[PDB]
Amino acid sequence: QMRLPSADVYRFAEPDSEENIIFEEGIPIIKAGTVIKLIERLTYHMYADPNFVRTFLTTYRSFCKPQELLSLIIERFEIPEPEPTEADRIAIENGDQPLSAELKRFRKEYIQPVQLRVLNVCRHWVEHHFYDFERDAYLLQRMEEFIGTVRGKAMKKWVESITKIIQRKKIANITFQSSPPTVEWHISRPGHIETFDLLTLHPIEIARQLTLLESDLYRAVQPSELVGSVWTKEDKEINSPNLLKMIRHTTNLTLWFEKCIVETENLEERVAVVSRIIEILQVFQELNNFNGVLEVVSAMNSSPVYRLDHTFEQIPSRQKKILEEAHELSEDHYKKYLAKLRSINPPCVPFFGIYLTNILKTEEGNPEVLKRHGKELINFSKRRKVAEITGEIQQYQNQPYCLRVESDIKRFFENLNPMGNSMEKEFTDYLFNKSLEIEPRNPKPLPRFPKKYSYPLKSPGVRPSNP
Amino acid sequence: GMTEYKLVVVGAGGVGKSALTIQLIQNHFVDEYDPTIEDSYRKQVVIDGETCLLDILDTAGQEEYSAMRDQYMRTGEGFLCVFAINNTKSFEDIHQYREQIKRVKDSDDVPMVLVGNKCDLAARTVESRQAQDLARSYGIPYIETSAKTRQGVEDAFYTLVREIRQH
Amino acid sequence: MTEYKLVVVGAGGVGKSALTIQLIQNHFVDEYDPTIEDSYRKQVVIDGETCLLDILDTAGQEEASAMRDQYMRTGEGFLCVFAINNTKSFEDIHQYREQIKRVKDSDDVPMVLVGNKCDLAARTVESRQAQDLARSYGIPYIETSAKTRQGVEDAFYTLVREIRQH
Ligand SMILES: Nc1nc2c(ncn2[C@@H]2O[C@H](COP(=O)(O)OP(=O)(O)NP(=O)(O)O)[C@@H](O)[C@H]2O)c(=O)[nH]1
Ligand SMILES: Cc1cc2nc(N)n(Cc3ccc(F)c(Cl)c3)c2cc1C
Numbered sequence: 067q068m069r070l071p072s073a074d075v076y077r078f079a080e081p082d083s084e085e086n087i088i089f090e091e092g093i094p095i096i097k098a099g100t101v102i103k104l105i106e107r108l109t110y111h112m113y114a115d116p117n118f119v120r121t122f123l124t125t126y127r128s129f130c131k132p133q134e135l136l137s138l139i140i141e142r143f144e145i146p147e148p149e150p151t152e153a154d155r156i157a158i159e160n161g162d163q164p165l166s167a168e169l170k171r172f173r174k175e176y177i178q179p180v181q182l183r184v185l186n187v188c189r190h191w192v193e194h195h196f197y198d199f200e201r202d203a204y205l206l207q208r209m210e211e212f213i214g215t216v217r218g219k220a221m222k223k224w225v226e227s228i229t230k231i232i233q234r235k236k237i238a239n240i241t242f243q244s245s246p247p248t249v250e251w252h253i254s255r256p257g258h259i260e261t262f263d264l265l266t267l268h269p270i271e272i273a274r275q276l277t278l279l280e281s282d283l284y285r286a287v288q289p290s291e292l293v294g295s296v297w298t299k300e301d302k303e304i305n306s307p308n309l310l311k312m313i314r315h316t317t318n319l320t321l322w323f324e325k326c327i328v329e330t331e332n333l334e335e336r337v338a339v340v341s342r343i344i345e346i347l348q349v350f351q352e353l354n355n356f357n358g359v360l361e362v363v364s365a366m367n368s369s370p371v372y373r374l375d376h377t378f379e380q381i382p383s384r385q386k387k388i389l390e391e392a393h394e395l396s397e398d399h400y401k402k403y404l405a406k407l408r409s410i411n412p413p414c415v416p417f418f419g420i421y422l423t424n425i426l427k428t429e430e431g432n433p434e435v436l437k438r439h440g441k442e443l444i445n446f447s448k449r450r451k452v453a454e455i456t457g458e459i460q461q462y463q464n465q466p467y468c469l470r471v472e473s474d475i476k477r478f479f480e481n482l483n484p485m486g487n488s489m490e491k492e493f494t495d496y497l498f499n500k501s502l503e504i505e506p507r508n509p510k511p512l513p514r515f516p517k518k519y520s521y522p523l524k525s526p527g528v529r530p531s532n533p
Numbered sequence: 534g535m536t537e538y539k540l541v542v543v544g545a546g547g548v549g550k551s552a553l554t555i556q557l558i559q560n561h562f563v564d565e566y567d568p569t570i571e572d573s574y575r576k577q578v579v580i581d582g583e584t585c586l587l588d589i590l591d592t593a594g595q596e597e598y599s600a601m602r603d604q605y606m607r608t609g610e611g612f613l614c615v616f617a618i619n620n621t622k623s624f625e626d627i628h629q630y631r632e633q634i635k636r637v638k639d640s641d642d643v644p645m646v647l648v649g650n651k652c653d654l655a656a657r658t659v660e661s662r663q664a665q666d667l668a669r670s671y672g673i674p675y676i677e678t679s680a681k682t683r684q685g686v687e688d689a690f691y692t693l694v695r696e697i698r699q700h
Numbered sequence: 701m702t703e704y705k706l707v708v709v710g711a712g713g714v715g716k717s718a719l720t721i722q723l724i725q726n727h728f729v730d731e732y733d734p735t736i737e738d739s740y741r742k743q744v745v746i747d748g749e750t751c752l753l754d755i756l757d758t759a760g761q762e763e764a765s766a767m768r769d770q771y772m773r774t775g776e777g778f779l780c781v782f783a784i785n786n787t788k789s790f791e792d793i794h795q796y797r798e799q800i801k802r803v804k805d806s807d808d809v810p811m812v813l814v815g816n817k818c819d820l821a822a823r824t825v826e827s828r829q830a831q832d833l834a835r836s837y838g839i840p841y842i843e844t845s846a847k848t849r850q851g852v853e854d855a856f857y858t859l860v861r862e863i864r865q866h
């Protein structure tokens with residue numbers, strides 16, 4: 067086994083003990099440790115663990131400042147070389163070239179792997195966690211300096227590469243290669259944005275364009291918006307803007323569905339509206355857009371809509387079944403949703419809410435540190451649990467949809483604003499009052515209302531066409 | 534089998550709401566938690582001599598999905614309405630949560646308890662007398678809990694189960 | 701769902717990372733940023749069964765040659781990649797094959813031989829030559845382009861099938 071530098075000149079050579087590292091019960095899994103031990107294992111000479119690097123870089127800010135992390139890995143990089151051994155000494159004294167066997171081994175099996183793994187931390191940091199550097203220009207200067215002054219031919223290729231990667235990141239296309247299906251049109255024709263509405267756009271294309279929009283919103287959310295539960299805190303608009311944009315879209319679509327339903331006073335027309343919404347749900351299911359699925363289900367379970375017995379009675383049985391199957395995804399703490407998500411073939415759009423609750427509860431329900439033998443150790447298993455969730459999120463962010471954007475329909479849904487200038491409570495009360503108007507509480511009898519739509523109500527259906 | 538109660542936790546986000554259910558379901562003597570596994574929100578308890586099963590829905594973290602509240606609330610037979618005693622806005626929010634629960638359940642008399650949660654050592658801004666008066670005006674129990682010491686946590690949930698049993 | 705540990709190996713610059721990123725993101729990487737060690741995950745349905753692929757993307761530069769044993773121990777299957785316009789990378793294949801067998805102490809390790817950059821006309825390694833080698837190893841040979849996607853799913857999912865039948 068290789069001898070190490072003295073722990074006095076090089077801090078990362080301290081022997082493992084339960085006072086500085088605790089393992090979980092073919093590489094070890096770390097339950098807790100000092101920062102020094104975490105960094106040693108982050109850059110361990112015996113094995114690589116790129117997943118550990120992702121976990122660490124995603125979650126470290128809860129126990130180490132970015133400036134301090136950089137100081138520590140630079141310290142890790144600077145490894146002293148051992149002096150010549152007795153055999154080398156004797157060779158040198160006789161004017162011969164020493165074999166330097168121990169030195170060569172230490173360079174090859176300790177220094178070069180540890181240094182390369184420090185550089186891999188720097189590479190991952192810059193490529194996937196660049197916000198540290200966006201938010202602290204001095205941190206970036208320090209990284210540029212460190213990388214730019216690493217000498218020696220062994221590291222040279224990666225040093226030159228990481229220098230270029232940093233420069234690219236500072237100033238900063240899909241193959242399928244089957245073509246996307248043809249865009250489908252119903253009553254509203256291309257370019258006639260003024261007529262776009264729930265019933266005039268093709269239900270297939272409504273679902274497709276919402277899926278592209280909701281996929282883009284899903285794919286834009288970074289772990290920085292999630293770790294530390296920052297989307298729930300005072301500065302959430304600063305720290306979690308992509309997440310909040312995503313959630314607000316979902317909320318607005320749900321409210322739009324409710325509004326379309328309760329503002330359609332005529333029973334027959336309202337049945338057509340609900341039936342069209344369930345057709346859109348069916349296409350969401352086909353596209354694996356689970357956010358879209360739950361947008362619809364949330365609308366149908368809302369107070370204004372849920373109580374509309376006369377409308378429900380006229381919905382075709384096959385659509386009742388579709389809605390029921392969709393709702394059952396959410397039953398028993400999303401048991402069937404979770405199984406379905408894990409079984410489909412991506413691309414998909416997950417429901418984000420579950421991830422948020424699990425991240426928040428993991429962070430709230432586990433201690434930052436473990437106290438052992440008089441020492442405070444960083445609770446790393448807590449951070450690993452958070453990173454397993456952010457890792458799952460990222461895994462579903464990779465696969466793009468093979469669907470063509472329609473710029474006008476996209477804009478129409480980007481600009482949807484069912485609440486107008488009203489506050490939430492005011493709008494929400496309005497919707498419920500509309501519900502009460504169109505279908506009064508028993509024993510009040512059911513009124514009749516005039517029709518509002520001048521165009522045909524018959525759906526073109528949700529099976530795609532192909533000339 | 535035994536009776537199972539579907540309990541739902543509601544209240545403002547960002548002020549330690551999640552500690553209530555976590556402290557209950559937890560351990561209850563080793564501070565750790567994996568919300569990912571079922572039985573992280575199901576718990577068998579004995580209340581007034583009768584064994585029952587608690588199923589608790591706490592969607593803490595999903596507060597911005599405001600149009601999903603009806604759907605989540607619909608699943609429950611009893612409700613804990615939680616505010617933080619150092620956050621007046623969360624206390625002022627309670628009225629709308631209660632109104633929303635009544636609407637979803639279509640009833641003026643839904644089993645619920647008001648819970649004032651102490652989530653840190655920051656200064657209290659809602660006096661217990663304020664919260665008592667509000668609870669009395671609603672005809673419901675008031676329980677104060679600590680997010681750190683587990684104090685009041687069993688009382689909050691057991692009291693709600695009693696409100697359900699006596700409905 | 702079963703989890704599969706795939707490892708991509710071969711000489712520097714043959715396109716190991718470009719292949720992996722094309723599979724993961726459907727995107728072609730034009731830049732040549734030498735890898736140290738990267739990890740990717742992909743949920744995918746193969747032959748009707750949902751799989752979770754863990755893909756380890758490794759270093760081809762010789763300066764990293766002393767660090768291969770560690771990832772070879774964990775891998776369940778190996779994509780052995782050369783470039784069809786680079787004869788030396790083809791000659792480097794046999795060293796990876798032997799080391800993998802050495803490390804796992806087995807003659808029966810799931811592998812696929814991959815001839816990458818098949819979009820380029822200037823070929824210097826003939827298909828027959830690579831095919832002969834693959835047969836001597838008892839493994840399939842698939843020509844790929846990370847640029848056009850030609851053969852990319854076939855190479856990775858063929859490796860999954862071999863692990864599955866192992
Ligand atoms: N024309 C063409 N170029 C390709 C193809 N695959 C990779 N390249 C190019 O070849 C170069 C090397 O790619 P890269 O994926 O980095 O190779 P690597 O094997 O991962 N290198 P390393 O071992 O150092 O990490 C890049 O410029 C890349 O764009 C391919 O199929 N066709
Ligand atoms: C699973 C499920 C079952 C339902 N049964 C009723 N009555 N609703 C409400 C409702 C009102 C008016 C409609 F037109 C419809 Cl279709 C549905 C339900 C909603 C859901 C999500």
Ligand SMILES: [Mg+2]
Nearest residue numbers: 716717734735
């Ligand atoms: Mg590479």
